[PDB]
Design a protein around this motif. Structure first.
Motif, PDB file in Angstrom:
ATOM      1  N   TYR A 130      -6.110   1.311 -29.456  1.00  0.00           N
ATOM      2  CA  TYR A 130      -7.103   1.187 -28.400  1.00  0.00           C
ATOM      3  C   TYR A 130      -6.516   0.766 -27.063  1.00  0.00           C
ATOM      4  N   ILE A 131      -5.466  -0.060 -27.057  1.00  0.00           N
ATOM      5  CA  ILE A 131      -4.818  -0.436 -25.805  1.00  0.00           C
ATOM      6  C   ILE A 131      -3.673   0.495 -25.424  1.00  0.00           C
ATOM      7  N   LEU A 132      -3.281   1.419 -26.297  1.00  0.00           N
ATOM      8  CA  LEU A 132      -2.243   2.395 -25.990  1.00  0.00           C
ATOM      9  C   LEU A 132      -2.808   3.803 -26.106  1.00  0.00           C
ATOM     10  N   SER A 133      -2.048   4.767 -25.599  1.00  0.00           N
ATOM     11  CA  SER A 133      -2.486   6.150 -25.533  1.00  0.00           C
ATOM     12  C   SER A 133      -2.048   6.916 -26.778  1.00  0.00           C
ATOM     13  N   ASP A 134      -2.181   8.243 -26.730  1.00  0.00           N
ATOM     14  CA  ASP A 134      -1.661   9.097 -27.789  1.00  0.00           C
ATOM     15  C   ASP A 134      -0.145   9.184 -27.741  1.00  0.00           C
ATOM     16  N   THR A 135       0.416   9.428 -26.557  1.00  0.00           N
ATOM     17  CA  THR A 135       1.865   9.543 -26.447  1.00  0.00           C
ATOM     18  C   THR A 135       2.544   8.186 -26.573  1.00  0.00           C
ATOM     19  N   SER A 136       1.850   7.110 -26.205  1.00  0.00           N
ATOM     20  CA  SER A 136       2.469   5.792 -26.225  1.00  0.00           C
ATOM     21  C   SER A 136       2.605   5.255 -27.642  1.00  0.00           C
ATOM     22  N   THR A 137       1.725   5.676 -28.551  1.00  0.00           N
ATOM     23  CA  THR A 137       1.758   5.200 -29.929  1.00  0.00           C
ATOM     24  C   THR A 137       2.786   5.946 -30.773  1.00  0.00           C
ATOM     25  N   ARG A 138       3.173   7.150 -30.365  1.00  0.00           N
ATOM     26  CA  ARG A 138       4.163   7.943 -31.075  1.00  0.00           C
ATOM     27  C   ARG A 138       5.589   7.607 -30.659  1.00  0.00           C
ATOM     28  N   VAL A 139       5.771   6.702 -29.691  1.00  0.00           N
ATOM     29  CA  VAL A 139       7.098   6.222 -29.299  1.00  0.00           C
ATOM     30  C   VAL A 139       7.734   5.444 -30.442  1.00  0.00           C
ATOM     31  N   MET A 140       6.903   4.790 -31.257  1.00  0.00           N
ATOM     32  CA  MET A 140       7.354   3.991 -32.392  1.00  0.00           C
ATOM     33  C   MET A 140       8.124   4.818 -33.417  1.00  0.00           C
ATOM     34  N   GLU A 141       7.956   6.126 -33.376  1.00  0.00           N
ATOM     35  CA  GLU A 141       8.664   7.015 -34.320  1.00  0.00           C
ATOM     36  C   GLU A 141      10.067   7.377 -33.803  1.00  0.00           C
ATOM     37  N   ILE A 142      10.233   7.809 -32.534  1.00  0.00           N
ATOM     38  CA  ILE A 142      11.589   8.086 -31.944  1.00  0.00           C
ATOM     39  C   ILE A 142      12.375   6.777 -32.038  1.00  0.00           C
ATOM     40  N   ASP A 143      13.547   6.770 -32.663  1.00  0.00           N
ATOM     41  CA  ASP A 143      14.225   5.544 -33.148  1.00  0.00           C
ATOM     42  C   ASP A 143      14.790   4.507 -32.204  1.00  0.00           C
ATOM     43  N   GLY A 144      14.993   3.286 -32.741  1.00  0.00           N
ATOM     44  CA  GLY A 144      15.663   2.202 -32.004  1.00  0.00           C
ATOM     45  C   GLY A 144      14.740   1.268 -31.299  1.00  0.00           C
ATOM     46  N   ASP A 145      13.455   1.317 -31.570  1.00  0.00           N
ATOM     47  CA  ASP A 145      12.514   0.499 -30.772  1.00  0.00           C
ATOM     48  C   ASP A 145      12.789  -0.942 -31.145  1.00  0.00           C
ATOM     49  N   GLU A 146      13.666  -1.159 -32.114  1.00  0.00           N
ATOM     50  CA  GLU A 146      14.045  -2.533 -32.451  1.00  0.00           C
ATOM     51  C   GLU A 146      14.698  -3.113 -31.217  1.00  0.00           C
ATOM     52  N   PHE A 147      15.522  -2.345 -30.525  1.00  0.00           N
ATOM     53  CA  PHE A 147      16.334  -2.843 -29.397  1.00  0.00           C
ATOM     54  C   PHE A 147      15.545  -3.190 -28.150  1.00  0.00           C
ATOM     55  N   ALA A 148      15.928  -4.266 -27.502  1.00  0.00           N
ATOM     56  CA  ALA A 148      15.152  -4.810 -26.398  1.00  0.00           C
ATOM     57  C   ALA A 148      14.964  -3.792 -25.315  1.00  0.00           C
ATOM     58  N   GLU A 149      13.960  -3.999 -24.493  1.00  0.00           N
ATOM     59  CA  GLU A 149      13.671  -3.014 -23.462  1.00  0.00           C
ATOM     60  C   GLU A 149      14.688  -3.050 -22.338  1.00  0.00           C
ATOM     61  N   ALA A 150      15.345  -4.189 -22.128  1.00  0.00           N
ATOM     62  CA  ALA A 150      16.392  -4.289 -21.122  1.00  0.00           C
ATOM     63  C   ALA A 150      17.683  -3.604 -21.543  1.00  0.00           C
ATOM     64  N   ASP A 151      17.779  -3.130 -22.783  1.00  0.00           N
ATOM     65  CA  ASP A 151      18.867  -2.255 -23.187  1.00  0.00           C
ATOM     66  C   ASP A 151      18.599  -0.794 -22.860  1.00  0.00           C
ATOM     67  N   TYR A 152      17.335  -0.405 -22.705  1.00  0.00           N
ATOM     68  CA  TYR A 152      16.971   0.978 -22.428  1.00  0.00           C
ATOM     69  C   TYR A 152      16.614   1.197 -20.969  1.00  0.00           C
ATOM     70  N   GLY A 153      16.925   0.242 -20.104  1.00  0.00           N
ATOM     71  CA  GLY A 153      16.753   0.407 -18.682  1.00  0.00           C
ATOM     72  C   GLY A 153      15.455  -0.108 -18.109  1.00  0.00           C
ATOM     73  N   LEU A 154      14.710  -0.926 -18.842  1.00  0.00           N
ATOM     74  CA  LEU A 154      13.397  -1.377 -18.409  1.00  0.00           C
ATOM     75  C   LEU A 154      13.387  -2.895 -18.359  1.00  0.00           C
ATOM     76  N   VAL A 155      13.086  -3.458 -17.193  1.00  0.00           N
ATOM     77  CA  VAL A 155      13.056  -4.905 -17.033  1.00  0.00           C
ATOM     78  C   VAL A 155      11.684  -5.320 -16.525  1.00  0.00           C
ATOM     79  N   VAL A 156      11.283  -6.534 -16.885  1.00  0.00           N
ATOM     80  CA  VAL A 156      10.111  -7.158 -16.287  1.00  0.00           C
ATOM     81  C   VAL A 156      10.532  -7.696 -14.930  1.00  0.00           C
ATOM     82  N   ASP A 157       9.874  -7.245 -13.869  1.00  0.00           N
ATOM     83  CA  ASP A 157      10.287  -7.632 -12.524  1.00  0.00           C
ATOM     84  C   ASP A 157       9.070  -7.957 -11.674  1.00  0.00           C
ATOM     85  N   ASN A 158       8.918  -9.230 -11.331  1.00  0.00           N
ATOM     86  CA  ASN A 158       8.087  -9.660 -10.212  1.00  0.00           C
ATOM     87  C   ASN A 158       9.078 -10.076  -9.133  1.00  0.00           C
ATOM     88  N   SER A 159       9.327  -9.173  -8.200  1.00  0.00           N
ATOM     89  CA  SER A 159      10.210  -9.438  -7.084  1.00  0.00           C
ATOM     90  C   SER A 159       9.735  -8.605  -5.913  1.00  0.00           C
TER      91      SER A 159
END
Ligand SMILES: [Mg+2]
Lengths: 134, 50, 134
Positions: free
Chosen positions: A1-30
């Protein structure tokens, strides 16, 4: 309900164990991402006028909360309209050309008519020369 | 419309749809606001994510 | 009396035993949803002028109380005008083509008349020479 169709299927393409800052995505308030957010909505407001972005798209931009989804909507709506204007230029070009084709087809039809109109005067002049000669 | 998207983009939309929801659900800006009061009183500001 | 026809029907679906925040809906008074209400009501006014949004729907937006209802209403009427402006262009496009269609057949009617006209002077001309030969 809080995610989309394409967003829920990301869990299948592998490695989601690894942190998001390893895949180029950072939390940034700057001040970089607020400047990019304030640019991307000012650019959309300058694209709302001049009829480049529809009123369907801008309300999706106001309810997006991610700088890359609202970037792709500016890209997607520009490619759709610039495809529509390029085919509207194409259909208006061939329409005057088929108008140029139908006027050309009738004037050579006028041209072929007067040459077949003339010869039947000429061969019937041979006939009216022929009958009284007997 | 997901052909013009990118893999780093779909991972970024999913990350924000998780974060935009639960910040508004739990009212996380107040959880961080009580944590600042321990920062000025202990010198410590700790959170557990479970 | 306080709910719509659609809003009394979600009770028939098997989900209202659970909290609303499990289906993506939270109560919010922030700087986020207050900016959205400005950005929808300012975009409504820029759609009211330039003839994109009617005076009936603007009265629905002021008495809407939901930021996603008035999102679905601005997208509703903008889709209503884009289909009318597309069909009126296509109706004007076929109108110039059908006038050009009827002007085409009438000058071919001027064409087909004068080929059958002149041969009628020719075939009666052969009757003249055949009578005098007797
Ligand atoms: Mg009522």
């Amino acid at each position: 309900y809080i995610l989309s169709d394409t967003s829920t299927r990301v869990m299948e393409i592998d490695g989601d164990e690894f942190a998001e800052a390893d895949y180029g995505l950072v939390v940034d308030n700057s001040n970089g991402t607020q400047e990019l957010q304030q640019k991307l909505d000012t650019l959309a407001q300058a694209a709302l006028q001049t009829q480049t972005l529809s009123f369907s798209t801008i309300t999706k931009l106001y309810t997006s909360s991610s700088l890359a989804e609202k970037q792709r909507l500016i890209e997607k709506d520009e490619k759709q309209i610039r495809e529509r204007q390029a085919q509207a230029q194409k259909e208006q070009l061939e329409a005057q050309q088929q108008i140029a084709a139908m006027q050309q087809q009738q004037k050579e039809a006028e041209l072929l008519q007067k040459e077949e109109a003339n010869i039947r005067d000429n061969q019937t002049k041979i006939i009216i020369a022929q009958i009284q000669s007997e | 419309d997901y052909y013009t998207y990118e893999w780093q983009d779909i991972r970024e939309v999913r990350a924000n749809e998780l974060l935009n929801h639960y910040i508004k659900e739990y009212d996380i800006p107040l959880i961080f606001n009580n944590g600042f009061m321990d920062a000025m009183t202990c010198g410590e500001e700790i959170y557990q994510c479970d």
